[PDB]
Amino acid sequence: FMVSLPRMVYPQPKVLTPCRKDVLVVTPWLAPIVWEGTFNIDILNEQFRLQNTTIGLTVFAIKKYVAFLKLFLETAEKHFMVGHRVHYYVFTDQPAAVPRVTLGTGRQLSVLEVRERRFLSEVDYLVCVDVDMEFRDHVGVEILTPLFGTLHPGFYGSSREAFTYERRPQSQAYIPKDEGDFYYLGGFFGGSVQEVQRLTRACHQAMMVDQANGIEDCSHLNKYLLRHKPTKVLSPEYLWDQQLLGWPAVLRKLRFTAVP
Template sequence: MFTNNWGKSGRKKYCLFIIFIICLSLLFIFSFSWHTLENSEWHPRAMFPCKAVSTSKASYLDLDQLKEVKLQRMLYEKPETLKPPRSDVLIMTPWFAPIVWDGTFNIDILNEQFHQRGVRIGLTVFAIKKYTVFVKTFLETAEKFFMVGHKVNYYVFTDRASEIPNITLSEGRHLVVLDVPSYKRWQEVTMRRMEIIRNYSRELFINEVDYLVCVDVDMRFNDHVGVESLSNVFGTLHPGYFGASRQYFTYERRSQSQACIPSDEGDFYYAGGYFGGTVEEVFKLTNHCHQAIMTDKENNIEAIWHDESHLNKYFLYHKPTKILSPEYLWADYGGSPAAVKRRRFIAIPKDSQIRNK
């Protein structure tokens, strides 16, 4: 209790002192809290990070420098809202990924968009051992039909670089021969593709191209294959199973394998001979599949269809943003369904012993 000697003046000074101490404490608490928040992932500036430009990982995207992609005046038939371009096939997945069939796209519009973006495309193939005999036909037909008019790098992985032919390429297109080891078993060769594509995605592709298309070399291009096929990550319906029920898909069913898909799951059966996407997404895909393959190897198990089995497992839980119809990877399985109006990329008949030569 205050004494009379304290007086009104003393009590006033005491109150001001207390207020000062309280304000100083609040200021300290606020400063400390803000510093902590600023360095956490919840800080307002951290909640909306800028995406790094792909060509320079240390820089950040300047929104004022974004390039406008504006189509030129073009004449084409008006799309009809109530008349879908194809009613005989599924053209959209339940997760809104388009399925690309003949008649479902306008290539002139797409070409204009991709040209304005200056997109660069990498095409990877593996020509191991005697598979080098397919490279000449592969490249010659690619020059006629694959991404015509766009910038393309052909990446040929081989253990026999001297056998890769020198093909005259169109302007803006380049052949890059990359040395890789061979393996005794063709199964090992095909599974190692995931590891090799992963490694080169990180070390080379990320600096040279925007999209990667990963295909088999024992094929020939037979019709247009263009930018309509490109997306963040895409797969291709297997020509032998695109009309089959889930129960007939040849997924890996053994629970011991990392590629195992339960019998009550699965959207489509994807072919291992044609997949791709942006370099970043292909890196994630191949890295995941390679790690799963290595885990299986440690457990002495090999998936029934090798890397294709792991690819199907990946696409089950990492849905592709676009799916290509069997037009983009055709092989004659005893018939030519009416739904497949164009055969764009076709398997070449080969000696069954060539894998072991």
């Protein structure tokens, strides 16, 4: 049951004006592709707050990568799901090195030491990101959906033959030259807990099969998302490297970026 939205005043959507003429904003399976100018965040925030949505954010910080946690968390506090309930899950081999970062209300952090079902009872969505990154602009409930992937910032303009998919037929991750929608990158993906756990289970099983066959890019992610199409795709706004790629006109905002 979803309750009624309150009265809200905002500009009328214009049926005979595209919001972007420079980029594709829907996939051929009718999933939105999330670019700045496609969404009204006020509408979406209402829809999500009325469901009291909790977002989990998972990050692996091992060895020297623990050093990126402070900036990662500070900037998430500024930009990630602000106004909603957030549970950060930091997987680390160095629990005592996790910095003590001050969090907004309704936001919590758990540290899990490394050498499942918990997520189902704790959060509605899971977002899995790399820790060596920083938020620079809004990353909010516009991304939330059963299953989403993000466009590789190095390849969004490329033809699919150029995508660095797995190309050896003996690999479970094999995608032929004539197949492929997009090249997704593993730095930023998510969905419902159920969907994200399906994805990671399928990648893990295919990885075991390849290792069994003596075969060792985000190639499994890409095979999964070819075969189980995401319900949203995020633009490279959500996973950028300004050092390597600059700031092209097609990017109106740079939301989540590499840290040198």
